[PDB]
Amino acid sequence: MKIFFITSNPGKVREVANFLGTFGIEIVQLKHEYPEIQAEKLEDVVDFGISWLKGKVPEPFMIEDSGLFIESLKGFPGVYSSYVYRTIGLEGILKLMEGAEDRRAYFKSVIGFYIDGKAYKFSGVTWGRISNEKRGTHGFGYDPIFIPEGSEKTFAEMTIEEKNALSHRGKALKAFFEWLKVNLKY
Amino acid sequence: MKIFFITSNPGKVREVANFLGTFGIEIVQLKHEYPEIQAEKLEDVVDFGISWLKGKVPEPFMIEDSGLFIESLKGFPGVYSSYVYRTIGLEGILKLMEGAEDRRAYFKSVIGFYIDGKAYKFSGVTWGRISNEKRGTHGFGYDPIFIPEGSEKTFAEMTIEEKNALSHRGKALKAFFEWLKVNLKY
C-alpha cells in the first residue's frame, strides 16, 4: 500500500518511511506546498493543511506537523519550532535556558491522513529535557539538545530506528499504523 | 524550595511539578523503591511508605498514592488501581460496568510529606462517572474513562493544567501548598 507524504522535509520522510516500510507501506514524498497557518495547536495547522490540499494531490495522502514545547518557556517554540530553529537555532534555546531550574520539555507530532474524502489525525508526545550542550550527528532541528525521558542520549545521537522507537513521531506513526491495519486491511 | 518526590510514575511527577512549580517549588523525582502495603485505605499505604523511607532519602520528601473507586463495584479497584489497570485495563472496567445502572465513581489522592522528623498527609477527592467508551490522549491509567462531575470531557481529554484544576491530585496538592505556605513560609 502506498501513501503520499506531502512535505519538504527530507528528514521527516526518512523517519516515516523507515517506520512504515517495515510493514509493507510505501511512502512517496510529494513536494506540494500548502499553507501552514499560525495557530496555538499543531492539530489546527494539520486540519487547515488537509482542507487546502484535498483534491489537489493523489490519495491517500498524509502531512505532519511537529514541535518542541519547553516548560520554562511557556511552550515555546512549539508550533513555530522550525522558524525559531532557523533563526536563533540551538544556541538561542540554550541561551534562553541558562540558569533554568526546570529544563523539561516535550516533542509532539501530529499526522494528518486523508482517504475516501475523509480526514483523520494521529498524535504522539515524548517528554524529556533540554541538554546543556548539543551532541549528535543524526536527525534534524532540535534533536541535538533533546534527551528523551529514560535515555542518556540526545535524539541526534540515535539512528532513525532508535529515534522512532522513542520519539513523538514514532508514537504518532504507531497509532497511524494501527488505524491503517484495522480500517484498510491492506 | 525543593521537595523530593519519591515515585516511579512520570505522569504523577509532571502533574505535581506543574501545579507546585507555579508557586516557586521545585520538584525533584527520586526513584527509590519502597513497599506499598495491601490495605483498605490509601492513607495506610502512605503511612507505611513514609515510615519505611525516612532516613534513607533527602528531605523534605513526599510520596503519593491514588486510586479509582467505583460505586457499583464496592470501591474496586481502589488501592489496587495500578495492578488492575495493568491486567484487565480499560476494557476490563468497561466490561464489568456493562448494564450498570449507576456509573458513579471517585478518584482519590493522598500525599504524604516528611520534614524535620515528622509526617503529614493531604488528600483530595473528585467524584465523577465512568464513560461507556475511552477518549483522550493525555494523562495515564483510567483517565480515558473517567469524566469528573461538571465536565463533558474525560481526564484524558484534558491538559495537565486543566486536569489539575479539577482532579483529586489537584485538590490534594492545593491542601499541601496551603500547608507549605503557612508552616514553612518559603
Swiss-Prot record, chains A, B:
Coiled coil: none annotated. It is an enzyme of class 3 (hydrolase). Its EC number is 3.6.1.66. Its cofactor is Mg(2+); Mn(2+). Keywords: Hydrolase, Magnesium, Manganese, Metal-binding, Nucleotide metabolism, Nucleotide-binding. Mg(2+) binds at E36, D65. GO terms for cellular component: cytoplasm. Substrate binds at T7, S8, N9, P10, G11, K12, S66, F140, G141, Y142, D143, K163, H168, R169. The active site is at D65 (proton acceptor). It holds the Pfam family Ham1p_like. GO terms for biological process: nucleotide metabolic process; purine nucleoside triphosphate catabolic process. One of its GO terms (molecular function) is ITP diphosphatase activity. It catalyses: XTP + H2O = XMP + diphosphate + H(+); dITP + H2O = dIMP + diphosphate + H(+); ITP + H2O = IMP + diphosphate + H(+). It comes from the Archaea. Belongs to the HAM1 NTPase family. This is dITP/XTP pyrophosphatase. It comes from Pyrococcus horikoshii (strain ATCC 700860 / DSM 12428 / JCM 9974 / NBRC 100139 / OT-3).
